[PDB]
Write a protein that binds this ligand. Structure first.
Ligand SMILES: O=C(O)CCC(=O)C(=O)O
Ligand code: NA
Ligand code: NI
Ligand SMILES: [Sr+2]
Ligand SMILES: [Sr+2]
Length: 311
């Protein structure tokens, strides 16, 4: 798993990011310019949030129950559950996610965010601005690696910025060791902050799941299915999963950037050529999203209906 220092020479960064995108669809970045103090404060906010009493968490349960990952995927803050498991043949546990949009930060959106812990809005608004800035920088390195003009993705293709704070209860003897099953992210690009082992990447060419080392001040970058399609498979998407920790409750902070639901997705036209014919026909992001969220029969079930020029 490449670890890319963003204070190296510009051209080296472009070259290393491009190779990682071609080879794996996942890499880590260090010396990335986001304040370490802000990364630590954001993790502390989520530790404090997930430790709040059940009565506080009811504020994020629409109509009194957790949300599910199904359309419409709203931007107002909600608690989501998934993946029920049995621990020690005794207690049930699940994967909890607090998720909300971040951009644009409309007053109506901000007022859906937690107000306890009391530093939530200040810390997480600052965090979201910094992580978006880093994401857009990485997308520009990707533009240069693909041969596209800088700023290609600075439009409706990055209109949605979802923050997903995941909480994985520990279990030493779980019904299943996987707390989050293997998936591609459906969006364009994701930045993930972690501080505890559990994230693994599927090396498809080697049919092997390998650890993504936790570096608490780094960001893990993983390319989503939308970028796999837009790059016409010149870049890989990342298939990744999370293993429940035996001892510690694990928290990760994901920033998932991607298109609006009114967007049409297709391979970037300027890169298509006679020897690089399009491998997907254009499709509505919202129709893709419905399939992506519903059909788990294959990792790329969401885009299978749109594949073309298959040989
Ligand atoms: O918890 C993690 O490290 C991964 C989270 C993830 O893959 C997701 O939310 O899409
Ligand atoms: Na625990
Ligand atoms: Ni993911
Ligand atoms: Sr409830
Ligand atoms: Sr092998």
């Amino acid at each position: 798993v490449p670890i890319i220092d963003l204070q190296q020479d510009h051209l080296l960064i472009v070259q290393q990011i491009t190779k990682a995108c071609q080879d794996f669809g996942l890499f880590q970045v260090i010396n990335h310019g986001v304040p370490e103090k802000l990364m630590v404060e954001a993790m502390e906010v989520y530790k404090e949030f997930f430790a709040l009493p059940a009565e506080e968490k009811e504020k994020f349960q629409p109509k009194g129950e957790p949300a599910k990952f199904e359309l419409p995927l709203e931007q107002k803050a909600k608690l989501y559950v998934e993946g029920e498991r049995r621990c020690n043949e005794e207690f049930l546990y699940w994967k909890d996610t607090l998720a909300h949009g971040c951009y644009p930060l409309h007053e109506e959106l901000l007022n859906s965010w937690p107000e306890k812990p009391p530093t939530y809005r200040d810390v997480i608004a600052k965090y979201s601005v910094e992580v978006r800035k880093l994401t857009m920088r990485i997308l520009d390195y990707i533009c240069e690696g693909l041969g596209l003009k800088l700023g290609y993705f600075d439009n409706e293709l990055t209109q949605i910025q979802m923050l997903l704070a995941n909480y994985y209860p520990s279990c030493p003897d779980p019904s299943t060791t996987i707390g989050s099953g293997g998936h591609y992210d459906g969006n364009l690009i994701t930045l993930l902050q972690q501080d505890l082992v559990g994230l693994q990447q599927l090396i498809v060419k080697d049919d092997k799941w390998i650890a993504v080392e936790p570096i608490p001040t780094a960001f893990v970058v993983n390319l989503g299915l939308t970028l796999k399609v837009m790059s016409n498979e010149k870049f890989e998407g990342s298939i990744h999963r999370v293993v429940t920790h035996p001892i510690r409750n694990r928290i990760s902070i994901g920033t998932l950037i991607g298109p609006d639901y009114s967007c049409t997705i297709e391979p970037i036209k300027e890169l298509i050529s006679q020897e690089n014919p399009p491998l997907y026909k254009p499709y509505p992001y919202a129709e893709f999203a419905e399939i992506y969220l519903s059909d788990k029969s294959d990792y790329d079930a969401g885009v299978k209906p749109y594949k073309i020029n298959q040989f």
